[PDB]
């Protein structure tokens, strides 16, 4: 089997991407944030504290003839951005782009943190990291991909995120029309439950490539590119007037600037992030200070190849017995 679904930016900045997901019978379609940095499929629901729901579409398990309470199971998750959610668990039929999993754990939120409430466009998350990170207790549950994998034509999914435009998540096949040149594959460590890999270096604009190993995670659920402070300083030094602002929470730059590109290495291959991808616009409405899309990972504890990086590539998440990651230009 295969599946193919379009993923759509939630706003003009590509702060996140939503993908429609069918849950239950008859289908209830929710727009979920596909997150290769976590491993829970959770949704706003009829059980979510009413004051914490503000415009989201909810899953109502009592209206699904295939929903079953997973007795005794609870979940609770905290994300790197400080947000969180928790609740109980149903199993139900879940379909993405024509690919159907029966008996998928659908984690129903009883509580969500304010950032989730305040984002009316995201109805929940669909985790695509390794199932070892799944938070369901006392019986850990499998991700949608893990459940689907054996049925797929090939045990892979691909992320093809757009810049200020829709893109595609495919399951079970590699669309050879969706990228240019070849796909370069690179080793993955699953030790921390992430799609963790090592970039071979970077360049800023038309500058020389610096060969240096940068361990980090491919994370579709993180907006920005978080890299070591040395790398990030080298980038922003090429933008007149850019500075790290403790009050804003990262590098800012004059909105009048033209940003240089940023290149990262994948083996001997190179992925170029155009400068415009690194612009996250005014820090507040009407400001001439703009927020940068490359930020320091210092104090996160891990480097994160988030959407800023991934949207410059066609990315293969290869879930073979020994997982790997592939990157192509597009």
Q: Which CATH architecture has domain 5-174?
A: Beta Barrel (2.40)
Burial of 255 (0-12, 13-18, 19+ CB in 10 A): middle
- Would you mind telling me the total number of residues written for the chain in this entry? 330
- Determine contact, residues 214/279, Cβ cutoff 8 Å: no
Active-site option among 45, 108, 199, 261: 199
Instruction: Give me the numbers of helices (H) and strands (E) for the chain, helices first please.
Output: 4, 24
The answer for residues whose C-beta is within 8 angstroms of residue 184's C-beta and 6 or more apart is 266, 267, 268, 269, 326, 327, 328
Q: Alpha carbon of 142 to those of 111, 204, 213: distances in Å? A: 22, 40, 32
CATH class for the domain made up of 175-330? mainly beta
Burial of 138 (0-12, 13-18, 19+ CB in 10 A): exposed
Catalytic (active site) residue 213: no
Block residue for tokens 């602002």 = 245
What is residue 61's three-state secondary structure?
helix
Q: In what order do the strands lie in the sheet with 262-266?
A: 269-273, 262-266, 196-204, 210-218, 303-305, 225-227, 294-296
- Determine contact, residues 135/104, Cβ cutoff 8 Å: no
User: Please, after which residues is the chain broken with C–N above 2.5 Å?
Assistant: none
What is residue 265's three-state secondary structure?
strand
What is residue 100's three-state secondary structure?
strand
Active-site option among 35, 40, 92, 219: 35
Residues 240-251, buried b or exposed e (16+ Cβ, 10 A)?
eebebeeeeebb
Catalytic (active site) residue 35: yes
- Which has the closest alpha carbon to 123: 11, 17, 12, 15? 17
The encoded tokens of residue 235 equal: 């980038």
User: So where are the chain's domains?
Assistant: 5-174, 175-330
């Amino acid at each position: 089997s295969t599946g193919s679904a379009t993923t759509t930016p939630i706003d003009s900045l590509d702060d996140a991407y939503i993908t429609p997901v069918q849950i239950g019978t008859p289908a209830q379609t929710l727009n979920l944030d596909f997150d290769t940095g976590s491993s829970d499929l959770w949704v706003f629901s009829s059980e979510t504290t009413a004051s914490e729901v503000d415009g989201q579409t909810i899953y109502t398990p009592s209206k699904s003839t295939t929903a079953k309470l997973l007795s005794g199971a609870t979940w609770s998750i905290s994300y790197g951005d400080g947000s969180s959610s928790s609740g109980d668990v149903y199993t139900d039929t879940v379909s993405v782009g024509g690919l159907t999993v029966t008996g998928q754990a659908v984690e129903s939120a009883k509580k969500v943190s304010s950032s989730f409430t305040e984002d009316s466009t995201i109805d929940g998350l669909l985790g695509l990291a390794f199932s070892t990170l799944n938070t369901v207790s006392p019986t850990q549950q499998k991700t949608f991909f893990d459940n689907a994998k054996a049925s797929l034509d090939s045990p892979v999914f691909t992320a093809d995120l757009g810049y200020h435009a829709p893109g595609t998540y495919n399951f079970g096949f590699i669309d050879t029309t969706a990228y240019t040149g070849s796909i370069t594959y690179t080793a993955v460590s699953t030790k921390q439950g992430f799609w963790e890999w090592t970039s071979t270096g970077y360049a800023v604009g038309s500058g020389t490539f610096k060969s240096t190993s940068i361990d980090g995670i491919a994370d579709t659920g993180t907006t920005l590119l978080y890299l070591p402070a040395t790398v990030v300083s080298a980038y922003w030094a090429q933008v007149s007037g850019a500075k790290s602002s403790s009050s804003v929470g990262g590098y800012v730059f004059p909105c009048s600037a033209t940003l240089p590109s940023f290149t990262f290495g994948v083996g001997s291959a190179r992925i170029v992030i155009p400068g415009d991808y690194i612009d996250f616009g005014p820090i507040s409405t009407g400001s001439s200070s703009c927020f940068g899309g490359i930020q320091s990972s210092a104090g996160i504890g891990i480097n994160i190849f988030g959407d800023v990086a991934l949207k410059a590539a066609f990315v293969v998440f290869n879930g073979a017995t020994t997982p790997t990651l592939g990157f192509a230009s597009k």
